[PDB]
């Protein structure tokens, strides 16, 4: 319910924000703890250190309205983003103690298997819908999980909603971007599953995503905050000896172009 | 229908939002553990093991104060944004699947054959009957084509239906009828194989335009918008038994409509 | 043919709808169980194990009661919408296939090599003979190229035919002739390998335009529209014997035509 | 070299050339001899009959200049090509004595594995750069192979150059199109590797490749010759009993559109 | 930032630079030494001969500015590049002593597995961000590796920066292009992982990459130097007997088209 007026131009009417988000795979430096697997659907008690979570940050922008009593005020409008997964070339490492190919004689398996990549740029926290594979899962304290009162949580229960308002706390497996909300956020997600699937990861500085909607309006930054969200699961690392697996995530870089937009107060 | 001009001005457009939960054979995203015949006859799949199409009819706002005039208005579906919801649930490798690396690694994610379809129309989706095995005995509580001979394994033009009941028309014995559906747009993809990686996008930035060559979208007969889908995402394998279950995910729809004048 | 102007006005356009059922070696979507030679000679594939091209000539409304005038009319095919029918049958994993997960999981779906072709023309599709094994003995009841030497394994320009009989020209010994077919458009894809996932779209929203670089579609000689296809979707494996059968699916065609004036 | 002037139009100013090249996989009829494999890098002595080679032909064009002493002359200019791999549907054969699937009970493996497809259209022979996987390889009598004096032949040694001037004589594995030359040829190549990779082979008569460069100039046919080159390795055939493998290649059709082009003489 | 003025046209205002870079896989001629694999994360001591490194070269350009104090000066602007991996067809070799398919009876495995391809064109050295898979790795004498003082080196530690200023010295696995810098370079990278993944390698002379940014400005060559960078890991070669694996890399050709650009000094 924001009445959007004209773009405000002139000196200092545009700015570019640069930020990076480190991955939250369950521990702080790119890997989950070795993943444990329940023998049945109940009990199913995944430790916090084994659950990849969304990354998020609010970037404070230059204050626009010392006076909020005028019939019009200014908002920062996100018009475009360049975003990069950082450290893709680390997956050329086949010497750091993974399970060896060619019956033990070849190199270590690279990081491989299921991939899940999402980035989002908005003027407020990303809106989430709760959904899980197993409604009987006992989620750990210190992650935010939807309430699991019945099996409808395995499909769409519209009572299960959240905002992505804490970095490294909302597990990827029990929340997805809510397509029924997020009027003021653009999100872009991919999942490529399978067991030992080859990760396919580009890295270029030449690609821009335009964030304008049908009316030529980008996300409008409420309270002069820019909201960045992502997850970048790149596959599993297998330990050579134990053969236990760890999620591997990589950091993401954002460059967001903003302009001043007049709106009705 | 003789299609005339778009009616513009206040309240001439609306957006309909809806979601459809998947009908994989039980109500909460999974089939019952799938059984497999030892021969083509008898072949008796239980209802709880057969994925079915999801469908809904949304009653639309009143737009005609009279239905006897030489022109009337219909809601015209211009575009749709649609999303498979819960794609990130497939990052779960702890909930009691068959373990990789000889039992030492994580559980297999949901994987294998995928079948994704959505449709938006102004009347029920029209189906053509077709089966893999004409000897199959379909269960009580589903709508299956009559199977009188083996031509049901290819195209028997006698085997037609309308998708008019949610969770009742099995995916494996009906497909969208390309000879009908003048007033519905459908979009389907099948990706088969045994352990195939599911590839599932999730974004709020992609719009499908529903206009035909003449610039006319589906026209909502009886002020009904008809949504249909299936989203089989693969199989869940039980760690101990190694039995498999179909997994389906819900689908969200946002449909943009405008008022269209037509000859009555 | 000297092609002149498009004839417009009432009844200047028509749409032809047709379907072709697959010819995999038996009448209802499957080959007989496939046998495999132990050497290149003898190699004697039965007719029931050899997929063949589907084809039909559709009679169009007669245009020229008088064929003596300096100009006459021909039907010109401008576009086609075509669909493989029954794609969703490949969601069936209960009808007696080899079971995954060591016998505990579902049946393998139909998978492996795929070969899909459709063609629309104003005369029969022109074929080039080419085989994998020049020593193959092709059976009675199919049309196969003569095999007098091993050049038949590559391009022997002496080996030509017209697709003039439904279910009679094996796919493996004939391909569309790129040196002919001036008056036919053909569109073919082969995806090989052993257990390869079939990837099969099904939509009513995709149109193929048949106009050449000069804006002219196939011209229907003698008021005949010629439709051809093959749709090998993979192999079905029998649970017990583990023998394999080719699976094919039917194909639907909707062809838009317009009247074109030509010099007589 | 050539100062390019105007396109010559009017009657007889255009022509279409149709040709086919049969594959040269090591024997004349689509297959290599069964392939033998060295136990070490030295000695490594591949027989000619086991080495796929490039196909090539020069097509004579209508003679344009009885008098080659005028200040301007005409050249045939290649503007576009339609090209097709012929015999793709042969790969639906699963009965002709290959290794059987389903533990011997199913159909024969189709032709599968590494694919290499190239076509080229030019106004002079295709220019080649020598490059090998093993500089210790002894190439056979009856093929043209680069001299192998040191291991730089495994990467780029700019001393190792050739012209594709003989059909079925230049092995694919020791020559590639030279990107530093070929000003007057367009080449188009794809390699898809791996062990049992599915071949993906289109066949249509509806696809045209334009051969014009950034200046709107196609290959200019020196001496009224059109030069066609290709290779089409479609994978390996496995013999049911021995399990030895043969390269399989398919023939390629070309239709080339030419127009008369005035040049400075 | 440079204030960019008009393109300078006229005779000698454009030039084309051609160059090739041979790969640096750990030895001089296209292959790493046989790769060794640690049994644990510490110690993990990859020899230099087993670590693929980036290729780079500075190409000297014609000197533009006799007086470097004028209010405007000229810079060479890179507007487009044609780039080719050379030697792709060498991967059709299945005779040179690899592990044999069909249980020893078939041909040798071709080069296959993880691929990593990057090319970059800039007016200064490519800027790098340090990131590793294992912060406990001991990088060898003779390579430039980021300092590894804690596990943040496995994600984005913004302290870990470098410039690609030496050919065959910066390992691919511990450096990636820095998306927070490189304003004056265009880089284009792909990684395709997995164990035995088919390499997919095109080779054509018909494809041009435009290097102009959103404002129509290509990289500007500081000190009249053009900076070229790449890596082309094409997979692993498996030795038939030992079954040890070697990285295989291929050389890359560049053709860069430049024009003179006026800039405010
Ligand atoms: Cl303003
Ligand atoms: Cl941090
Ligand atoms: Cl529900
Ligand atoms: Cl029939
Ligand atoms: Cl002229
Ligand atoms: Cl010949
Ligand atoms: Cl100038
Ligand atoms: Cl060098």
Residue numbers in the entry:
A (entry chain BBB), D (entry chain DDD), E (entry chain CCC): 22 to 286
B (entry chain AAA), C (entry chain EEE): 23 to 286
Please quote the paper that reports this structure:
Polyomaviruses are small double-stranded DNA (dsDNA) viruses with a circular genome of approximately 5,000 bp. All glycan-binding polyomaviruses analyzed to date engage oligosaccharide (glycan) structures featuring terminal sialic acids that in mammals are usually presented either on gangliosides, which are molecules composed of a glycosphingolipid, i.e., a ceramide and an oligosaccharide, or on glycoproteins, which contain mostly complex and branched oligosaccharides attached to amino acids during co- and posttranslational modification steps. These sialylated glycan structures interact with loop regions at the outer margin of the major capsid protein VP1, at the apical surface of the polyomavirus capsid, as revealed by X-ray crystallography and cryoelectron microscopy. The VP1 surface exhibits an astonishing plasticity, providing virus-specific interactions for a range of Neu5Ac linkage types and further specific characteristics of Neu5Ac-containing glycans.
In order to probe whether these viruses are able to bind Neu5Ac in a similar manner, and whether differences in regions surrounding the binding site might contribute to subtle differences in receptor engagement, we investigated the structures and ligand binding properties of three representative animal viruses from this alignment: the mammalian ShPyV, which was found in commercial sheep meat, and two avian polyomaviruses infecting geese (GhPyV) and finches FiPyV. GhPyV is a bona fide animal pathogen, as it causes hemorrhagic nephritis enteritis in geese. We expressed and purified assembly-incompetent VP1 pentamers from all three viruses by following the protocol established for HPyV12 and solved their crystal structures at high resolution. Superpositions of the VP1 pentamers of ShPyV, GhPyV, and FiPyV with that of HPyV12 confirm that the core VP1 structure is highly conserved (RMSD values of 0.65 Å, 0.83 Å, and 0.73 Å, respectively). In HPyV12 VP1, the BC2 loop comprising the Neu5Ac-binding site is formed by amino acids T69 to Q83 (T73 to E87 in TSPyV VP1), whereas the putative binding sites in ShPyV VP1, GhPyV VP1, and FiPyV VP1 include amino acid residues T61 to Q75, T57 to E71, and T58 to E72, respectively. We calculated all-atom RMSD values with PyMOL using the BC2 loop of HPyV12 VP1 as a reference. With a value of 1.82 Å, the BC2 loop of FiPyV VP1 shows the largest deviation, while the BC2 loops of ShPyV and GhPyV VP1 yield lower deviations, of 0.77 Å and 0.84 Å, respectively. In the case of avian viruses BFDPyV, CaPyV, and GhPyV, hemagglutination activity has been reported with chicken and human erythrocytes, functionally supporting the sialylated glycan receptor binding properties we report for GhPyV.
